[PDB]
């Protein structure tokens, strides 16, 4: 169909197009035409890595497509994927020339791991876009920070920045049997669940470091949080460790 256009009439936003304005409507400069990228975050979608990755999938036969946008929204959750196949080959294409990561991310969820990747490109299952630096794509690029979102086109009428990288390891990526681990260091991991917020993950990381709960050997140590530990949208808001290489954090 024809691409809709947002215009302000009667102190309210309305969808319209250039062919259904009235002579009273005045477009005197291209400066009144604006493209904006809005994050799925703002609509109330679950942003944890298990929930977010379920919205993406691999498909072949569909070429990727790209559209510009001028202004974007500060994101709390972004994602940066480094996925390989079990044979070692890359699942995602390198970012084309001039495609930089999404510029404003409070938490960048960097996910490394493996999966079958039964498809040439990773698309958004719900039809949304992957928002990069002033560029929206239909597919995910390797190692490039993105926010999920959608684009609107408008006719206008005539605060420090901090980013924290949260690293994960993944097995069976893409399938319906995907497993995630939160990486404390290269040998200490926490089995991840959907209910863990970014703030809880950063405090669990600070607790493990200061309490000496990191692995002090050459082997891999994986902690499990017991379900008895728990603590809305992002905008509206005594631990015992014993080893059982699994373990439990009560």
């Amino acid at each position: 169909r024809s691409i809709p256009l947002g215009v302000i009439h009667n102190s309210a936003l309305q969808v319209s197009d250039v062919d259904k304005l009235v002579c009273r409507d005045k477009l005197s400069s291209t400066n009144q035409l604006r493209s904006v990228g809005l994050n799925l975050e703002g609509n109330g979608v679950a942003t944890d890595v298990p929930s977010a990755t379920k919205r993406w999938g691999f498909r072949s036969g569909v070429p990727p497509k790209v559209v510009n946008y001028e202004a974007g929204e500060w994101a709390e959750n972004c994602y940066n994927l480094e996925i390989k196949k079990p044979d070692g080959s890359e699942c995602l294409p390198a970012a084309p020339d001039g495609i930089r990561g999404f510029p404003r991310c409070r938490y960048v969820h960097k996910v490394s791991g493996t999966g079958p990747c039964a498809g040439d490109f990773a698309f958004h299952k719900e039809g949304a876009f992957f928002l990069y630096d002033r560029l929206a794509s239909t597919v995910i690029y390797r190692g490039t920070t993105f926010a999920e979102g959608v684009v609107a086109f408008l006719i206008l009428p005539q605060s420090g920045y901090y980013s924290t990288t949260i690293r994960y390891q993944a097995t069976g990526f893409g399938t319906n049997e995907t497993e995630y681990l939160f990486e404390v260091d290269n040998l200490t991991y926490v089995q991840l669940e959907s209910r863990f917020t970014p703030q809880f993950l950063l405090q669990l990381n600070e607790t493990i470091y200061t309490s000496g709960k990191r692995s002090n050997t050459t082997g891999k140590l994986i902690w499990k949080v017991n379900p008895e530990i728990d603590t809305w949208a992002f905008w509206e808001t005594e631990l015992s460790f014993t080893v059982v290489x699994x373990x439990x954090x009560x």
């Binding site: 947002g6 304005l21 703002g42 408008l154």
Partner: protein, 129 residues
């Protein structure tokens, strides 16, 4: 038509970034200027007139037509969406003959009316011999 937000939630505030920034000295020279991370200005819009929650629903509803447009175009696309909207706007008003006092002609002969019917009093008022 109007915009009906049907999303599970709405963040009523838009904390946004853009690159629509008088330069300070030699900061415009790319060799001396900011890195790619430092070209952004920030702003905060609130939900006055419900514009933010309407904008979120508008971007959501734009996706189908936008995706269908992207499927039909080749990635060697040589035209911009907003420039074509601007051209279509002008073609709608001025792509044909403008019939004055018509519904599709954006010509107001207001002052031209009260410049003729005003200056009739130069020939009907001066009718003396």
């Amino acid at each position: 038509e109007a915009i009906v937000n049907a999303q599970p939630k709405c963040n009523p505030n838009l904390h946004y970034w853009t690159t629509q920034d008088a330069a300070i000295g030699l900061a415009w020279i790319p060799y001396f200027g900011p890195a790619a991370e430092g070209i952004y200005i920030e702003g905060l819009m609130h939900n006055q007139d419900g514009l933010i929650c309407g904008l979120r629903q508008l971007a959501n509803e734009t996706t189908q037509a936008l995706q269908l447009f992207l499927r039909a175009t080749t990635e060697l696309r040589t035209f911009s969406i907003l420039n074509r909207k601007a051209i279509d706007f002008l073609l709608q008003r001025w792509g044909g003959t403008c019939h004055i006092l018509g519904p599709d002609c954006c010509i107001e002969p207001a002052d031209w009316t009260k410049n003729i019917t005003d200056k009739i009093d130069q020939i009907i008022h001066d009718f003396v011999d």
